[PDB]
Automatic annotation (TrEMBL), chain A:
The keyword Metal-binding is assigned to this record: yes
Enzymatic class: oxidoreductase
Record EC number: 1.13.12.7
Domain of life: Eukaryota
Segment of the intact protein contained: 8 to 436 of 546
Protein name (database record): Luciferin 4-monooxygenase
Compartment annotation: Peroxisome
Keywords: ATP-binding, Luminescence, Magnesium, Metal-binding, Monooxygenase, Nucleotide-binding, Oxidoreductase, Peroxisome, Photoprotein
CC annotations in GO: peroxisome
Catalytic activity: firefly D-luciferin + ATP + O2 = firefly oxyluciferin + hnu + AMP + CO2 + diphosphate
């Protein structure tokens, strides 16, 4: 079973939650800051822009039977269109910005999206790729006020379908079943050798929100101190840890790429309360030099949500930077990462049999596997690997064996 | 048809209990939940969480439900919320009695709700027994703030340990579910307009909405969950109880003073670094034109609110200035009902104008009698069908007693011409 | 021939446009360019730089030049300077209309310059469209403080994106060149001498000189480029427009209040840590002898100035003392023209005293009609050559209508009998 | 045509005389009372003091009968009063010769004979010397002490001198400086040697100085700190770097405090006890700044900005310091034109540049290799009475050939990255790159330098490598030739064969001796 949720999951569309969040924390004036450029967007800005963009996507002719995409590096305006999709319940495919033409065409062919948001920086590569895909009917630039040789930008586009009197306080996000409407088709190159694009329900999101909100697990930090986002937005881990920052209204500062120093510079200079990084930036933290040459006395909380090596690099950092024991992930998935760490709310776990397939009780070995709403609703257009991944009734086979750690210790230890 | 702001927090649908429960469970880590400014006694959130749950199961197994009514009679006292929230879990209605009623008054009071069980204080117990000797329907008393029973009078601890054991776990307990709009949360007595002791009925929904207002960052007090607010207004009365209760869903260290007398208020706000206060207008005037109230360091003060008979004659401006505060806003007409609605219309609250000669539903900038409609409005008086149809009319409108006019679509606030 | 102080900063030779341009470019880094004390809207210097440059090329490609005259009708508003400065680049004259005119008055005004394009505010647009329905020559209106168009009315953003594109770089833009003394910068209408609608003409030179004055550390606001000054005086009007405009060449964070009324001025001056205020005498009296105006913390104030018929003996002294200020010194001369000349004889300003009867030049300490000569002076009235020759005489001297004298060679300052 | 232009100027150059802008400065910022402070003595002059003295000195010099066709000099250590005479020369348009104060008799005379100045200004300290010296020079008619109230043994001091010609009631605000074209008038005649190996006197225009000020005013480049805040001056005034960086402090009205000599830790103390905002220094005290102990035992928290304008130890001293002192970023330039240093730092306003052919000499394009040259007004204008060095240093039309070779990043990026810092290296039989195309573009395992050029065969010029390994790792000559046989193709490799040795060669922090390795190649083309 695993922990009882502290903040009850928001029933409705994740769109609707995010919407409400933006509206509440409109007062925040430092929504996102580009650590590099120093560009800054306010919550109120994302709010207006996302609403405008929603009525726009609609009147232009899009719905749930379509798929939209965004291909951009880690960038301030990214959330405008993303969030707009979530209002309308249009599915959003996120493309990694650095695919080679080769890889990328492979990707877009999975979801096959009719509209594509993208970055200034990524625009040429997108035009180059779009000339190979008859279905990619329109591209829109997200981070420009002016159009780029005939390519439209979110501003112009939006002013086509919305006017001077538009009031996002007066907008309503479309309503639907948040468990059967797709939010994201994020493609993943993990198992086998196929690209295969994974499907994320809205419920997976509002549950991920529950987790960001919970004060024993997710980041318990002041709704107006600055958290750093570094993880790739196009990728599941980075998109969700980032996106969950809004229901709780945090000043996000954000870095384009994990590499080098400057991680340091950045984290000192903005008074960063919490960071959420993958384990390479953990090693750079633990056993890298002159990383106390910058004042990092700002750091309240640290998280890891990918492939975390032993509890020793973890202690190296917990100690170096004076932290409340950095605790985190073990088992994280292709899907919404992290579940069962230091089981989680809305996630149930079982131990059955290598041989029978019947659920055991306590202190008994057998293959450990998961069931949750937060789990992928399967893959896209591939009925094969859908029924391949999660079994006869919603259990996702992990491929390890171990046991129920008893009633009085409902935690996870696994034998093989 | 003035609608009033769109809610920034969607109202929690379920039992008001359930939300409070959830709140407590979430902020269990908070250890300085309520402090008795006087004794220096302290309860933690997690303690209230446990106690309220144990007491919920106790009351249940003891055999009570929606068809009964419980009461609590206590002065402002840390343990007050113990039984109250437990009631809200089970959906037993709670009648709150004022501790300083005279026997005369009190009997009248209890005869409205006629509660079978009565929590009380320790210094209020004599009086409660003295009274119970006149009311056959009052089968049990329980003391809320004692560890031992008191000459046969049970106390909350003994009572709870009767039905629960050491391994009891509030994380595994569940508050009853019901329709939060048709379940009475509270029966708070008030003798208004006529002077008769009539008892007001409050839905759970009325509460969950009041929580929505408190969460709201333009209206309700926007300050960090784990900084200290002072609530002093009397808990048995709606203003003090709802403002107090609403502190929980947002997890604030409350400090609480038993009585508004002179200073010491000063003393406390200094000594506990009080971020926000919420007071009635007597301590407002005391704030503004009483001297050497800048002899204590009150520079902790982020937010100030007032919610009864607000002295519009700019005492408010004087305090806003004296204590360098983000301008004190509050008042703008409250009620017998859940106080405070339409401050500096509020979410889930709409107001109209109609005209006192026909009763239509007037449009912009036009006078006529102003009155409110809301889920948050009182569900009526109790075993009295008379003054119910009199307070709120044919379709959910409650006549307030002023004329004003709708300040246009483009200024959706309220100005009213004569009071 | 009292000459008046030697300038400390040599007047910039070129177009006033070019100077404002360079200013914007230099202080582009300033991120708190203008703040709407009311709303809390803020524009950055670089934003004005881009907006104004784009607007300049826009105005040019749209087909305008010096032979037209443009207008602006707006209340005190962050975006006011957008179009204005753009005109100055192109050397198109700008007529400023007071935003509170009656249709009655406003048309009278507009008929002086007869402008073909009109920028205006969100707030001013109803009244303006109403007015353009009476004037054949008013071909186009554009809104300055909106991102989207307003029922068929274009806005500056849209207008600008018609003629410039994404790759436009204002660092590569260059302001038109002309002689800054024969090119009109501004046509500000004024009701002086007679109740008749006469429009005053200001050359670029007058502005580049006004900039000379604001930079001067004995006279103009001597405070660090990146401290916050308050502009409250009406932008459509000369005193307010120029005190405001002169701030950019010295790069000051401007906070701006739409209206003088109430304690909101006090609040503002506190909440933004305001170094200098420059006010007309009503908020001067409100300053010295108004109550509980120390109930707000005004300890931020280094300098105070006044420039609208200054004589408040000794109200000025009452505030100088009230607000621990380096003694507020100012006024002592203001006009139809660029207000403020001879304050506490100014650079590039000469004053003489002559004879009420002959009109021949006096020497020291001697009575007779006092009057001025300066490049900063009005180049005359607009379509009225009658009152041009009436105001400034045969050889550039402009008669004030007072008498007095030279406070000597050894004290080249002005007292008048 | 293809030219890199350079950053639009954020302050348009002041048309007129350098003296005129310098006047107007002193007059505007007259109110500052801490103009220059002897960080040593504590003596202090104010701005309006300098304004006075300099205007006085100006009219004195004119009535004494001097004009452009003359040349006045000044020999002095770093001293408060330096600017009085200097600025008055600039007012009057008389050219000025800054002599180094610690020249020997021998050197000094060769110098003075370039400019042949008739008036010499001097400091108390420098007087004996200058007199000694003047007893050789018949052309040097008058000395004047600058930092002493009383005359010395008949040597007239500035005050007596000025008083002959101005009275009690003299007013500088009424004085006008002389007017001329700022571009044809010499301002300074500061001599520099090293190159070729002779005493040759550089010519700086007035415009060079106006431009110079334009850069100092530049809020991205020059020191952007508030007028009436304390900056430290410490580089010797009698050299161009120090003189102009000091002189330019005046148009922005700064409280200068100044130390006479760079040595030791008196520096920390001062920059502390005066609350010093910015500093501008040479790389000696850069490296002492970064790598030297307990320099964090004095409080250097006042330190907004740092510049560095000489031979920049771009090793990692710049970063170490920007870090230690938590400063907004010390970022400097590249060029060392020998005249007004710093042209192209992290092109500069009013400076342009192009790259040309090694062979033709036509302007190249983006990412095209060839010799770097600049052309700016701010550049030296020539040498004094020497038509030989002039037509050498700058070409036909004002371009200064750096002798380095590089290319310009992009026209949408006008930056100059440059591959191989000198031309006299890297020869081949159809030019080949040396110390930076390869060398630094190949290091497995890291093998520490080697690009020289062996004269054989009589068919060309053999390239050759001088590889050295560190942690005993065995590489062969034949082995390396094939790792970098595909790294460059054509024919490059090393012809002779990767020789292996101990270190690299000498020269101050970096600079090889090229012929060192060629001769060291010799004796090591004989063994196993």
């Amino acid at each position: 079973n695993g922990d009882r949720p502290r903040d009850l999951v928001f029933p409705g569309t994740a769109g609707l939650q995010l919407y409400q969040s933006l509206y509440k924390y409109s007062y925040i004036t430092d929504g996102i800051i580009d650590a590099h450029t120093n560009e800054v967007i306010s919550y109120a800005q994302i709010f207006e822009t996302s609403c405008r963009l929603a009525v726009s996507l609609e009147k232009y002719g899009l719905d749930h039977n379509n798929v939209v995409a965004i291909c951009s590096e880690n960038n301030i305006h990214f959330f405008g269109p993303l969030i707009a999709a979530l209002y309308q319940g249009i599915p959003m495919a996120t493309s990694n910005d650095m695919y080679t033409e080769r890889e990328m065409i492979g990707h877009l062919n999975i979801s096959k999206p009719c509209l594509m948001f993208c970055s200034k920086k990524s625009l040429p590569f997108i035009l180059k790729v779009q000339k190979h895909l008859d279905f990619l009917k329109k591209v829109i630039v997200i981070d420009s006020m002016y159009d780029i040789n005939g390519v439209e930008c979110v501003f112009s586009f939006v002013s086509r379908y919305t006017d001077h009197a538009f009031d996002p306080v007066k907008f309503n996000p479309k309503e639907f079943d948040p468990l059967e409407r797709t939010a994201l088709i994020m493609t993943s190159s993990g198992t086998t050798g196929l690209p295969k694009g994974v499907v994320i329900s809205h419920r997976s999101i509002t549950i991920r929100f529950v987790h960001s909100s919970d004060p024993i697990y997710g980041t318990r930090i002041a709704p107006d101190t600055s958290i750093l986002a570094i993880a790739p937005f196009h990728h599941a881990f980075g998109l969700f840890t980032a996106l969950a920052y809004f229901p709780v209204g945090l000043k996000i500062v954000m870095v384009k790429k994990f590499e080098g120093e400057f991680f340091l510079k950045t984290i000192q200079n903005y008074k960063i309360a919490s960071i959420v990084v993958p384990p390479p930036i953990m090693v750079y933290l633990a056993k890298s030099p002159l990383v106390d040459e910058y004042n990092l006395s700002s750091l309240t909380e640290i998280a890891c949500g990918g492939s975390p090596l032993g509890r020793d690099i973890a202690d190296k950092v917990a100690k170096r930077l004076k932290v409340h024991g950095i605790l985190q992930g073990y088992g994280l998935t292709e899907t919404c990462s992290a579940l069962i760490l230091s089981p989680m709310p809305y996630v149930q776990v079982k131990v059955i049999d290598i041989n029978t397939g019947k659920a055991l009780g306590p202190r008994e070995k057998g293959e450990i596997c998961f069931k949750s709403q937060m789990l992928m609703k399967g893959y896209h257009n591939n009925p094969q690997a859908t029924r391949d991944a999660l079994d006869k009734d919603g259990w996702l086979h992990t491929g390890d064996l171990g046991y129920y750690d008893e009633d009085r210790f409902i935690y996870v230890v696994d034998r093989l």
